[PDB]
Amino acid sequence: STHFDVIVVGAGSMGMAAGYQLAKQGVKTLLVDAFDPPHTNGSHHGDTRIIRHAYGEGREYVPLALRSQELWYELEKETHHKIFTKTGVLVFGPKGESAFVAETMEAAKEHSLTVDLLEGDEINKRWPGITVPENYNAIFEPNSGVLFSENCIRAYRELAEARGAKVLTHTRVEDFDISPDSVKIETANGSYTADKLIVSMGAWNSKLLSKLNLDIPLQPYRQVVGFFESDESKYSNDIDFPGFMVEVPNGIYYGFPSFGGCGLKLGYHTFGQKIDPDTINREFGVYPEDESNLRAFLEEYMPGANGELKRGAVCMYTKTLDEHFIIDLHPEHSNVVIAAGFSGHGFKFSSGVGEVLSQLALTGKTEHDISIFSINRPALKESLQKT
Ligand SMILES: *Cc1cc2c(cc1C)nc1c(=O)[nH]c(=O)nc-1n2C[C@H](O)[C@H](O)[C@H](O)COP(=O)(O)OP(=O)(O)OC[C@H]1O[C@@H](n2cnc3c(N)ncnc32)[C@H](O)[C@@H]1O
Ligand SMILES: [Cl-]
Secondary structure: OOEEEEEOOOOOOHHHHHHHHHHHHHOEEEEEEEOOOOOOOOOOOOOOOEEEEOOOOOOHHHHHHHHHHHHHHHHHHHHHOOOEEEEOOOEEOOOOOOOOHHHHHHHHHHHHOEEEEEEEEEHHOOOOOOOOOOEEEEEEEOEEEEEEHHHHHHHHHHHHHHOOOOOOOOOEEEEEEOOOOHHHHHHEEEEEEEEEEEEHHHHHHHHHHHHOOEEEEEEEEEEEEEOOOOHHHHHHHHHOOOOEEEEEEEEEEEOEEEEOOOOOHHHHHHHHOEOOOOOOOOOOOOOHHHHHHHHHHHHOOHHHHHEEEEEEEEEEEEEEOOOOOEEEOOOOEEEEEEOOOOOOOOHHHHHHHHHHHHHHHHHHHOOOHHHHOOOOOHHHEEEEEOO
């Protein structure tokens, strides 16, 4: 007998932030998750996430990144959980041969972001532990950094629940019944109704959006990260070793300084195994590339951070064809909001996206510019199943 104002399906990075934003405004909200967030079956574990501001992916991203940053600072003040550490983020690559580095520099210039430009040995000198060729250049953002992602979700959940949000765990939503004036979800633990629906199922959006009559190319990828024993005198956050995202000949890599001796963390961004979220092997090391692609980068660029493997994690990216997000109202139902395809780089924006989702669910519009995330854009190749 319990109707809600808004139901959020998938209470992870995006959904839990949305739940917090809704609860904060006195909106009767129900968040439903297949597990118990934060957990290790989706896209938010592995402890840390990079937040950068000079987003060359598209100008719309910078404002969202800056708003999210302010929102993370707000979250830091509201909870006892640690949210953000300002490690700074270093971006480097071969001079004149990296679109990623080039776009980053252009984005910083275009938005007047504070950054340091350096190249060659200046990089190796500023950060002992980094060894790049002399023909490499870099752009460093001193004011961006690292978010403790599980902590963020945990905090948003505690804050949302304190304000009345209900969270139904270990409950997989299996189907949807949408009406012009109400929404309804079906689960093994029962059916629930509300005036509005927010769908943010992460990797599972690739399998369940069809239940909403949507056909959108979304490919989940198995993405691992490893924590390695390192020279703490060089790679510790305490000696200001930065978070980083860089481009080398074989692709893009991202990493984090050692925090409290946990070891430098590294991930290979441009490669991953195509998988299904319900059959993915979540054990690190089952594929030789898991560990070898990481050490190949470390032995060449951060040689003192190539020690014993201390820990591994397996997580997922869900990509759209253009690698831009999907944040929009369902094309046939204005009372349904979709958040999907974050393509491996959405966590830093989750605070801002929660705000956008809240606005879309409550008003059908948002003050943020989200045109590049339109569910109707051509590059997405979106279509309805029944037309
Ligand atoms: C995996 C990964 C991602 C990543 C990264 C490193 C790795 C290894 N590094 C990042 C970084 O440095 N900076 C950044 O900005 N992003 C980075 N990412 C990407 C980011 O983690 C992802 O884009 C983000 O986490 C996506 O969030 P979203 O909310 O989409 O996904 P989720 O957190 O997995 O939450 C989805 C939830 O929905 C639930 N679920 C699924 N199906 C159902 C059904 N049927 N019913 C109910 N609930 C459902 C899940 O259980 C999950 O909690
Ligand atoms: Cl993702």
